[PDB]
Amino acid sequence: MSLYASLNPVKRMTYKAKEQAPAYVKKTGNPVEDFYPSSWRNMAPVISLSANRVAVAFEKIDAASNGVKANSNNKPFWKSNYVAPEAPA
Amino acid sequence: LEKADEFFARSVTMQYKAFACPNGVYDIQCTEGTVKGAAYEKRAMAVSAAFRAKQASPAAKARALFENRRHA
Amino acid sequence: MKSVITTVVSAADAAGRFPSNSDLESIQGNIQRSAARLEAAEKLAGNHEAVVKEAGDACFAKYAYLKNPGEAGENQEKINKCYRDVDHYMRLVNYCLVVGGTGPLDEWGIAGAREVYRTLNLPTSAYVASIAYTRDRLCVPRDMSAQAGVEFSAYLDYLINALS
Amino acid sequence: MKSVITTVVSAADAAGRFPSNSDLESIQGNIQRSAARLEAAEKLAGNHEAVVKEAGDACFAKYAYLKNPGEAGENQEKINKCYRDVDHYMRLVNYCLVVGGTGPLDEWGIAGAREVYRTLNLPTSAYVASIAYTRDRLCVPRDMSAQAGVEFSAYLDYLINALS
Amino acid sequence: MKSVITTVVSAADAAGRFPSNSDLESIQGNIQRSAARLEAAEKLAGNHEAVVKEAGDACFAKYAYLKNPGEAGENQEKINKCYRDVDHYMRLVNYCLVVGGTGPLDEWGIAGAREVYRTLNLPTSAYVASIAYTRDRLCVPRDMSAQAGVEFSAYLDYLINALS
Amino acid sequence: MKSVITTVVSAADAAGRFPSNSDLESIQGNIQRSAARLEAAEKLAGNHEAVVKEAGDACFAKYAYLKNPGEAGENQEKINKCYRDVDHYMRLVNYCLVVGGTGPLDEWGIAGAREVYRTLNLPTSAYVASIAYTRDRLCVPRDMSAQAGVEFSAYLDYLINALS
Amino acid sequence: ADGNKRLDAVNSIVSNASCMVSDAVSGMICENPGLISPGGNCYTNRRMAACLRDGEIILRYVSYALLAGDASVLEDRCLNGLKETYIALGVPTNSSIRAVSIMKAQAVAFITNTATERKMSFAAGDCTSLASEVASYFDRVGAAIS
Amino acid sequence: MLDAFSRVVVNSDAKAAYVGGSDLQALKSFIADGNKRLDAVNSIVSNASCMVSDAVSGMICENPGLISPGGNCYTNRRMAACLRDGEIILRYVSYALLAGDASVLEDRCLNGLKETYIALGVPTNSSIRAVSIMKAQAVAFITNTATERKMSFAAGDCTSLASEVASYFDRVGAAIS
Amino acid sequence: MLDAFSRVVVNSDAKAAYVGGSDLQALKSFIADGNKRLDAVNSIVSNASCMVSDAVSGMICENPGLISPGGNCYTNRRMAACLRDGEIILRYVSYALLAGDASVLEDRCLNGLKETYIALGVPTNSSIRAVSIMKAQAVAFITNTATERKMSFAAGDCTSLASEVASYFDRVGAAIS
Amino acid sequence: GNAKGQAEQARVAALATAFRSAQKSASKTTAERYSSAAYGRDHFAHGCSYEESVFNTYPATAAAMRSKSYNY
């Protein structure tokens, strides 16, 4: 019913919904965690259209080149040195 | 353990026959036939000499094993 | 099975190298000749009971002594084997026209033929007479195209140079 | 001197046989590619002072450490020898475009190159950078035809696969 | 596994002969050198985390371009593999000091190394810089004895002559 | 690799008979199932990062003594191996959902597991706690369809009945 | 109002979405090959996959916004401070705007069924209002970053 | 050593039948896209050197036990032998793709490779992982679906050749399984 | 053995990858024409008894030397052994056609058939002639192209299954060649 | 050979290959003469100072001698 109400355009004006203020989370200055936190990051909605069926579902999006994935930067901990000297000028 | 021996033979033969084909051309070394029809006779010599060598005596064969192992 | 592809892959394999530009360049010549070499093969396939018929008796019209007693063609099953021996060669000519090289001929028809025809006491001159009769009355605008005739005739005298 | 003709004649010579139909069939592919492979060769011939000019300094822009003391490109005559070493390779690419095979490259440029560049302490990665720069900014409608460009590019990465 | 014993037994075996007086005479030289060659080996064994530590960053202080993007030492695990690649060579130097000949080096470190470092695009000059840094600040009275130092240094520049 | 097809072909082979009508009749049930069993599999495939995360710490919240010294989960790599041991089981559940039978579970996860977990001294009750936590908070309209949850849960307690 | 024109317009995009994304980023490389040069930030393996993921996320959101008939979710979720995150990472914004315009051209090609590489079967009529709407929606994401 | 043309000859020779115009259409369709086959083979020979090294490095970075002391790709000699082992496989698959028939690597490459590796102690899992990587690279080159390298072709479809070259790679892993 | 479903499981197990929605479409297309596969298998099991006897009789009437004294199909015992030899091959090809994967006659039928026949003295030419006849019969039954027998099917195309079952017969002759 | 005409065809083949062996280039033959002398000493004359002097001055005596019990 929330999806149906989100897609109905005439209920969008005759029933103007109220804003909900978000929960308090601390800002850290860096925008990569301020605007795209890990609780949301890379989620995006699938639209599947079949006979009398419209389905939308938010999924985490990844792509890949030669063999490793895009979100492999953030692999889980169970899947997881010398310091190089500085070069002179 | 049997056919692994024949793959090991065929591999070193294949690697050594690449010296006789330097970079795409057959050189003077192969030259199996010099007239028309000589290559089939050279085939029939070799495929019979291979049969003749396997009906050798056991003492000759046992000498040939150890002397090949000594020279390799 | 000597052909255009079979030559260049064996050369690249003996050199131990990948297929180069000259290897791919030779297959374009196969592509360009496929449209004249295959019509001769299909024309022979659709007509081979008449071409085999006029060659075998042209063999016997030239050498009428073969039907003598003590010869290679005395009684009827020898002549039936002669027509079969001719049809085998025309089938291999069709196969070499399909392949592109002379592989089917020197693999199954030429290799060892001199040892067979000597000890079984068959004259090779009577073999080459029927092949020469087929080559000489190939008539190039009607029977084939202009280019299919030279491709068909080039495999025929390969047999004549191989048997003589 | 590997080429289309050079392959089929030594194949026929090693078999001890006359030139067959598959031998003549491969030369037709040479005839059909001559009209796209020679355009690249003369375009390189008419333009080769600018093409190695931009490749040699692209070699040094990637590896600026080569002009350090104790390196391969310290003073001026080493850099002049580097431009000469690049021009030698582009001349051999022109020669392989003229011949048809990769014969001039593996005869005079590739064979023994790893022994030379190791004991004379030259990095092969700086050689392949200038060749890759030439391959990557070949621009196929303007600089050549559509078909001459891949014929030109196919010999370039033969050098890159041979040196690396 | 070339050593003093392995040489003379293979010579006596190829001649098909018993061990002679010259065979036993060569082992006395092994006995006389073990009392200077083994102290270098365990001095290296007891100290090898500091010796490889100062060599690997001496490799990067000379060639600071290796940490550039697109290079062999871009990110952290490449540098960790570089320290491992150096420790592997120092372990083989310890093994050749224990054996007596250069067998462990040309068996596991030298043979095939040029094919690996070329196709995996690693510069051998950065390998020899860390080995030359180790050879040049070996200090003869403190670090070893006077005789253990040249035994240790003679195996080090064997690597430098083999990689260059 | 027990499944619908694997059972009926093994039965027809042991009887030495051709596939009958009852053999073809059983595959229709696979066809009718496939449209509810495959969405559970890729729903697990697309979400397994968080499903294994909440199960492994639910294992440790129930049995907090496992992080004691001398236990199975003392230091960090034991816990990392525990998350891996859980992810291995969820992958096999995905495989059994794809196949149709319980073949991948009793082939690679169940057979021999009691001998391993006894001599390596791992408690199986801590294994079944994480699987029971996954089964109990599968929530049938949101996470899957109504019928896919039926199929996903039936393979989960197969593990619980096999390990206990 | 009418959905049979709207749902067709969404279905003409969400079907062939991966080809649109992979063609858009390859065209973006095809103009300037500095991003795949060593030193560009699409040069490594883990960067170009992230660029593909970002292009698909942008296409995901604009396809949802065309279905919803509004752009409020588009500016709440995606464009809520994307430009300064691309600045803080360090991202050439002109090339991403170029890839967005490439996707915008492909979308209005697919909606009008005037794509000259592939043909859909449709009913008879005019979908140019939806084409202008999705052009405006692509201009939203093109202007929200700069 | 048999190409696509000699295969139908050996097929119709057991029949003792002439090659007629019915089964010739499968051969003229082979001629009709011979240019696509050459365009496909060239795109693999062009970057075989990156294809081999990327496949062995991906097999090693997936399984870090091979570079362990006593692993099968431990020393420099064994690693050079692995890079030599993979290149021969790629070369024979290129031969079979050019010939249009798989009969050049069943007898020259795969005939006896099964027990050679288990006489040597070569682990069979990593070899099929490596050519599975090489297969995924080859299909990404027959079509222009590669990530950082795009080659210029004439427009059209090459999925038949991609399925053919995948079918040439599955039997390599099946011969050594 | 291995059906079409366990094949992708053993393919993705070396990856240690979950079976995702990209490679699942090859499995849902396998479900989408499962009825065609059952309709195809039934049409072969229905007249396997005529298929075997016609194949052995055609092999004998092509080569009359087998029934000569000292031929391999000379006596009644050898002829019954030949009719028994062909039916097992047809049964295993039907198993592989039902399973959607050839791995059931890889190891239960063809593993060792090569040297069994040459320890027995079974001529290898007539063996591939007979299964080539059986292949030509099977393709004539997957499609309704048989001469005197027509079976009622729903309308559509079954050429993919005919190519699949031809590919199941090519490796039988290749295993014994 | 083992057929009636096979024994003379070996003669005409062996007389052809000895003439084709004389058509090698200068680099092809001098390196061959050095490698034959290298082959003679490590395989035959191990500690024999006399035969190694024979081999260094006459390489074809080193080469034509076989180290194997080939029984030729």
Ligand SMILES: C=CC1=C(C)[C@@H](Cc2[nH]c(/C=C3N=C(/C=C4\NC(=O)[C@H](C)[C@H]4CC)C(C)=C\3CCC(=O)O)c(CCC(=O)O)c2C)NC1=O
């Ligand atoms: C952990 C270690 C690790 C790596 C080293 C890489 C290596 C790697 N690359 C690819 C995958 C590939 N590799 C290439 C190869 C190349 N691309 C080019 O442009 C060059 C010409 C050539 C050498 C670089 C291609 C074309 C693909 C397919 C498309 C792609 O992913 O880029 C795969 C296949 C994935 C699979 O199916 O199993 C792997 C393992 N990935 C990894 O996970």
Ligand SMILES: C=CC1=C(C)[C@@H](Cc2[nH]c(/C=C3N=C(/C=C4\NC(=O)[C@H](C)[C@H]4CC)C(C)=C\3CCC(=O)O)c(CCC(=O)O)c2C)NC1=O
């Ligand atoms: C001797 C060297 C030699 C070559 C290197 C090739 C070069 C080549 N390729 C094609 C021509 C072609 N090549 C392809 C192939 C492809 N197109 C794609 O988009 C896919 C990525 C790829 C599939 C593998 C296609 C589709 C054509 C057009 C003609 C055709 O479809 O047959 C043509 C004919 C038309 C033209 O002039 O371009 C030629 C000469 N042929 C040769 O003779």
Ligand SMILES: C=CC1=C(C)[C@@H](Cc2[nH]c(/C=C3N=C(/C=C4\NC(=O)[C@H](C)[C@H]4CC)C(C)=C\3CCC(=O)O)c(CCC(=O)O)c2C)NC1=O
């Ligand atoms: C696949 C290729 C292929 C061939 C080319 C032929 C070659 C061939 N022909 C014959 C056998 C023969 N070929 C001939 C033919 C002739 N004798 C003549 O006098 C004329 C020259 C000519 C007829 C015009 C005859 C008569 C025999 C039987 C000879 C005999 O057995 O006495 C035989 C011995 C086996 C047999 O008797 O059938 C063989 C191998 N067979 C083959 O399988």
Ligand SMILES: C=CC1=C(C)[C@@H](Cc2[nH]c(/C=C3N=C(/C=C4\NC(=O)[C@H](C)[C@H]4CC)C(C)=C\3CCC(=O)O)c(CCC(=O)O)c2C)NC1=O
């Ligand atoms: C596939 C291979 C193949 C061939 C090589 C020919 C061979 C051939 N030619 C003829 C038949 C003939 N061949 C010729 C000869 C010629 N005709 C002319 O107009 C010219 C003067 C001369 C070509 C230079 C003539 C005149 C006939 C008619 C009957 C005869 O006189 O023999 C026949 C009898 C059937 C017929 O009449 O067509 C056959 C089999 N046909 C084939 O199917």
Ligand SMILES: C=CC1=C(C)[C@@H](Cc2[nH]c(/C=C3N=C(/C=C4\NC(=O)[C@H](C)[C@H]4CC)C(C)=C\3CCC(=O)O)c(CCC(=O)O)c2C)NC1=O
């Ligand atoms: C016919 C084919 C043919 C070739 C391909 C070259 C190959 C070649 N180059 C050099 C020699 C050289 N080649 C270079 C070139 C370079 N060094 C670098 O740092 C860069 C990698 C590159 C410049 C971009 C330099 C600097 C030398 C001189 C090295 C030296 O003598 O110290 C030499 C040694 C002889 C000499 O000093 O001239 C040879 C054989 N010469 C040939 O005759």
Ligand SMILES: C=CC1=C(C)[C@@H](Cc2[nH]c(/C=C3N=C(/C=C4\NC(=O)[C@H](C)[C@H]4CC)C(C)=C\3CCC(=O)O)c(CCC(=O)O)c2C)NC1=O
């Ligand atoms: C015989 C071999 C041969 C070549 C490979 C090229 C290589 C080449 N390109 C350029 C020159 C150029 N090359 C390009 C590149 C391209 N141009 C475009 O329109 C596309 C965007 C892209 C092709 C994909 C551009 C834009 C210039 C102009 C100057 C520059 O920007 O570098 C120049 C300098 C002289 C000139 O301006 O022409 C040379 C030598 N020329 C040759 O003579």
Ligand SMILES: C=CC1=C(C)[C@@H](Cc2[nH]c(/C=C3N=C(/C=C4\NC(=O)[C@H](C)[C@H]4CC)C(C)=C\3CCC(=O)O)c(CCC(=O)O)c2C)NC1=O
């Ligand atoms: C038993 C003896 C033995 C050795 C000597 C080494 C030799 C060796 N090193 C590497 C592999 C490597 N070696 C290095 C080392 C370096 N790269 C540099 O830029 C510097 C020159 C140097 C660090 C100072 C690096 C970075 C790799 C990884 C290369 C890569 O995979 O991209 C490999 C490939 C396998 C692997 O990735 O581990 C091998 C066989 N390994 C051995 O098992």
Ligand SMILES: C=CC1=C(C)[C@@H](Cc2[nH]c(/C=C3N=C(/C=C4\NC(=O)[C@H](C)[C@H]4CC)C(C)=C\3CCC(=O)O)c(CCC(=O)O)c2C)NC1=O
């Ligand atoms: C087993 C192999 C092995 C070696 C080759 C050496 C190598 C070595 N030298 C030093 C350490 C040092 N090495 C020197 C060098 C010298 N010292 C002198 O008195 C002379 C002037 C000069 C010898 C010619 C100096 C002065 C230091 C002290 C710290 C420094 O200045 O680097 C260190 C750091 C630890 C330490 O201080 O001892 C190491 C590992 N040590 C080893 O364990």
Ligand SMILES: C=CC1=C(C)[C@@H](Cc2[nH]c(/C=C3N=C(/C=C4\NC(=O)[C@H](C)[C@H]4CC)C(C)=C\3CCC(=O)O)c(CCC(=O)O)c2C)NC1=O
């Ligand atoms: C293909 C299927 C497959 C599996 C199911 C697992 C099964 C499995 N787990 C472990 C091994 C282990 N499994 C665990 C897991 C746990 N210990 C606990 O205290 C908890 C019960 C749980 C974490 C929640 C631990 C800690 C080890 C390491 C035990 C040890 O080596 O001391 C081992 C021994 C080999 C190794 O050390 O990795 C095996 C075969 N592995 C597989 O390959």
Ligand SMILES: C=CC1=C(C)[C@@H](Cc2[nH]c(/C=C3N=C(/C=C4\NC(=O)[C@H](C)[C@H]4CC)C(C)=C\3CCC(=O)O)c(CCC(=O)O)c2C)NC1=O
């Ligand atoms: C593929 C396998 C798969 C599953 C089994 C589930 C398992 C699962 N559930 C939740 C997450 C949740 N699960 C529930 C439980 C329920 N929700 C309700 O509305 C009911 C009351 C009850 C079903 C009976 C709740 C309330 C949350 C939200 C966060 C929480 O409270 O745990 C999460 C965290 C991510 C998220 O919020 O979705 C996961 C991984 N998800 C999966 O991807």
Ligand SMILES: C=CC1=C(C)[C@@H](Cc2[nH]c(/C=C3N=C(/C=C4\NC(=O)[C@H](C)[C@H]4CC)C(C)=C\3CCC(=O)O)c(CCC(=O)O)c2C)NC1=O
């Ligand atoms: C649940 C999923 C779902 C869909 C995917 C659509 C599919 C769809 N579109 C239309 C019907 C239509 N679809 C279009 C759209 C177009 N025609 C064109 O010429 C343009 C290229 C394109 C605009 C982008 C038009 C103009 C009609 C007829 C008017 C209408 O019914 O809206 C119809 C009714 C008649 C028909 O079958 O055509 C259906 C079922 N509707 C749905 O309910």
Ligand SMILES: C=CC1=C(C)[C@@H](Cc2[nH]c(/C=C3N=C(/C=C4\NC(=O)[C@H](C)[C@H]4CC)C(C)=C\3CCC(=O)O)c(CCC(=O)O)c2C)NC1=O
């Ligand atoms: C919810 C909405 C949402 C988005 C829009 C994206 C936006 C986005 N992209 C990146 C992160 C990135 N984004 C890119 C993308 C690009 N760089 C370029 O040069 C091209 C112009 C462009 C691809 C076409 C790259 C290359 C990185 C990795 C940067 C890095 O190397 O650290 C990050 C940092 C975290 C991460 O790596 O994922 C974020 C938040 N992600 C989201 O979650």
Ligand SMILES: C=CC1=C(C)[C@@H](Cc2[nH]c(/C=C3N=C(/C=C4\NC(=O)[C@H](C)[C@H]4CC)C(C)=C\3CCC(=O)O)c(CCC(=O)O)c2C)NC1=O
């Ligand atoms: C090397 C440089 C290089 C490029 C500059 C681009 C070339 C390119 N092609 C298109 C243009 C397009 N791109 C697509 C997208 C697709 N077509 C389909 O049929 C698939 C479903 C999908 C992925 C292939 C479409 C449909 C068009 C418009 C073509 C048309 O009008 O039919 C566009 C966008 C509009 C335009 O500028 O024309 C670009 C930038 N690709 C490159 O490689």
Ligand SMILES: CCC1=C(C)[C@@H](CC2=N/C(=C\c3[nH]c(C[C@@H]4NC(=O)C(C)=C4CC)c(C)c3CCC(=O)O)C(CCC(=O)O)=C2C)NC1=O
């Ligand atoms: C075991 C007993 C035995 C042999 C020896 C060969 C002998 C032989 N070589 C041939 C034919 C032949 N021979 C060679 C040369 C040779 N081939 C190579 O791959 C390399 C590297 C070579 C140099 C040594 C070539 C190049 C050909 C041409 C066919 C080909 O491309 O391989 C032919 C066919 C002649 C013809 O058809 O004209 C024969 C019979 N066959 C046998 O049965």
